[PDB]
């Protein structure tokens with residue numbers, strides 16, 4: 001078991017990682033910006049290192065400072081959490097080069113999944129169903145590009161290979177817009193990622209966003225841990241996630257899960273991972289893979305009983321997976337509401353000092369947050385300050401518990417999305433289940 005790790009993150013996920021470390025007897029090093037001195041996990045950590053000023057570029061994205069903190073404390077590993085450097089292959093490369101364990105896959109694997117074109121090619125080869133597409137980068141020959149779009153059939157979507165999570169993409173519905181749409185996506189990709197490579201896919205009009213959780217060790221074991229429905233979103237930002245996905249049969253789960261686990265074996269995957277799919281008309285279509293542990297990981301934990309962060313740490317230490325596939329069983333239902341410090345009218349981050357705080361409790365209620373009474377939410381980082389996760393024997397009980405929990409949650413002094421989350425729980429279409437990726441924005445528009 002790893003002696004000491006650097007938690008290379010902040011907020012709720014850093015606290016999540018800290019708890020996992022404490023359970024396994026792993027010493028904690030909390031690296032933090034000067035604005036994050038009073039973070040809950042920082043105050044609970046065995047050792048603390050201030051790695052720079054408030055802006056992320058000089059703290060949480062500061063590669064030399066994070067590695068130096070690992071060096072000075074005698075830490076053996078670095079957990080990147082999600083966001084920041086978690087998908088940075090060069091960082092993972094430098095970490096291993098410096099002699100520390102990167103809690104994640106090999107840098108080569110991160111690089112592969114960050115290249116959406118090569119990732120799709122690897123998945124298609126492995127037998128994972130993908131979106132009908134160009135199967136390769138688009139060139140400058142517009143006669144060829146029109147032929148590809150005709151073969152696929154309009155509408156199509158142009159996507160940046162260096163993009164992801166809905167960054168750098170646009171829908172094309174006819175030949176007249178194809179040239180300009182390709183050029184613009186290319187230009188945006190060059191400006192944002194220093195990679196102008198773009199590809200084409202059949203545009204699915206009303207899919208659900210369904211993703212498969214995987215775990216793979218260094219002993220050759222690779223398992224799938226059911227799916228998550230992440231369709232309740234606004235402008236490429238998840239709002240509510242749930243597990244399992246409504247309407248997904250054990251047969252479908254088995255079908256797509258086995259294909260994801262087989263892909264892990266083929267590519268030599270290691271650690272936690274997420275296969276993102278579009279789900280439409282009872283069919284799965286792979287779009288991208290995430291190599292990090294994700295925001296919405298707790299819903300998977302509730303329905304399987306598997307502590308995913310602890311599995312990450314065990315894998316990194318050289319231990320096999322604590323569970324086999326036949327030991328993985330979907331039981332009950334979990335819903336996650338992301339709690340954001342945001343203005344209800346603009347959806348812009350709303351930082352400030354929390355004057356009164358109270359967390360919900362009870363059977364099946366899980367609260368994941370660093371916030372406390374007197375805590376100031378800084379303006380420099382993401383708006384998400386907490387996660388409320390509710391579990392039940394069925395979906396209806398999970399939703400009922402969420403409604404009760406949201407009503408107990410008090411966060412005064414700052415503006416939050418608690419009222420919005422309550423509106424979503426009370427939404428008849430959500431209560432029926434199976435709403436698509438576009439539902440929330442349509443609801444808010446009406």
Ligand SMILES: Nc1ncc2cc(-c3c(Br)cccc3Br)c(N)nc2n1
Pocket residue numbers: 131157165166201202203204205207208209233235236278287437
């Ligand atoms: N080929 C397609 N067809 C449809 C889609 C849809 C999404 C999507 C998703 Br999965 C979530 C929110 C918005 C959007 Br535009 C996406 N990220 N990628 C897609 N690729």
Ligand SMILES: [Cl-]
Pocket residue numbers: 082083293294295296
């Ligand atoms: Cl994430």
